Amino acid sequence: HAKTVICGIINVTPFALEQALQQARKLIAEGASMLDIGGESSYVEIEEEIQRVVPVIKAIRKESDVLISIDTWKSQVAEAALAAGADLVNDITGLMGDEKMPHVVAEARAQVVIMFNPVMARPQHPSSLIFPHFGFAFTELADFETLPIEELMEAFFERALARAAEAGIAPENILLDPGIGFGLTKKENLLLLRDLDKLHQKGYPIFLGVSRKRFVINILEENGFEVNPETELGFRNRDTASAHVTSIAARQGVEVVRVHDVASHRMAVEIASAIRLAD
Numbered sequence: 001h002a003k004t005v006i007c008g009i010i011n012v013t014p015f016a017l018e019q020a021l022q023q024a025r026k027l028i029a030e031g032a033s034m035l036d037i038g039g040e041s042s043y044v045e046i047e048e049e050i051q052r053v054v055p056v057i058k059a060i061r062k063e064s065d066v067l068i069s070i071d072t073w074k075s076q077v078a079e080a081a082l083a084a085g086a087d088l089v090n091d092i093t094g095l096m097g098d099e100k101m102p103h104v105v106a107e108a109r110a111q112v113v114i115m116f117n118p119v120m121a122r123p124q125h126p127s128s129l130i131f132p133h134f135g136f137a138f139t140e141l142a143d144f145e146t147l148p149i150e151e152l153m154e155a156f157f158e159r160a161l162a163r164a165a166e167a168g169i170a171p172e173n174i175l176l177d178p179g180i181g182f183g184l185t186k187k188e189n190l191l192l193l194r195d196l197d198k199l200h201q202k203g204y205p206i207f208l209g210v211s212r213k214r215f216v217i218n219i220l221e222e223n224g225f226e227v228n229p230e231t232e233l234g235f236r237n238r239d240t241a242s243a244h245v246t247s248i249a250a251r252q253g254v255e256v257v258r259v260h261d262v263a264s265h266r267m268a269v270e271i272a273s274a275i276r277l278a279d
């Protein structure tokens with residue numbers, strides 16, 4: 001198959017535009033084949049987010065054919081964003097945050113990432129508590145609280161794929177994301193990573209968030225590596241750590257990774273693929 005695509009993260013901060021246009025150039029030049037544009041943080045939020053991501057999207061589109069993803073769970077944002085050059089929606093609520101999202105994706109003929117969101121699925125699980133609240137969903141949710149992570153993931157996905165099926169999004173336009181880092185424990189995070197092929201067995205490409213996740217940070221810390229992001233040493237170790245997950249991921253054929261440091265992950269992707277595609 002084709003080697004792992006690197007998706008570089010561009011978070012527009014609430015000039016902000018010239019700064020996002022600058023990061024894009026940088027990531028492209030580092031070998032990003034896709035960029036993920038986010039503008040998060042009511043009609044007031046929908047409008048402010050749109051006025052964040054839309055100008056950025058247009059400007060990238062003026063100079064580049066790079067695949068652009070809109071990181072939004074709000075259908076009004078993804079709609080403005082596709083109308084401007086975006087190719088796909090990265091939905092961190094996996095179609096559960098907005099009932100009209102499926103239609104917006106279906107209507108635009110777009111690709112979509114359906115992330116498993118365990119924070120929505122288990123709002124009171126101790127790991128979820130620190131997370132904000134996603135969505136404008138689930139019933140009396142009482143089974144969820146209790147399921148193993150992989151049966152849990154499955155149930156969320158069952159729901160969300162049905163939502164997509166009814167909107168008529170072509171099955172070949174869907175990418176699944178296990179939701180690593182989101183109200184999952186260390187062990188659940190690692191188990192889901194250990195079992196990426198089970199998720200491949202379902203038949204969809206896998207979009208993976210491998211970058212600067214607290215569980216990898218803590219493996220570094222417990223093991224004598226400096227992890228303070230405000231040091232050169234700590235900053236680099238954190239990005240190298242992630243590149244290692246990309247190495248493992250790209251080797252088993254994960255289709256996309258979503259990442260901060262494109263260059264360290266391009267080194268992982270090249271080594272892992274050369275091995276994978278040996279013959």
Ligand SMILES: Nc1nc2ncc(COP(=O)(O)O)nc2c(=O)[nH]1
Binds near residue numbers: 009092
């Ligand atoms: N699909 C997907 N989307 C995401 N959006 C944001 C963040 C966390 O923050 P960031 O914006 O700095 O990456 N992580 C993910 C992830 O793992 N997967």
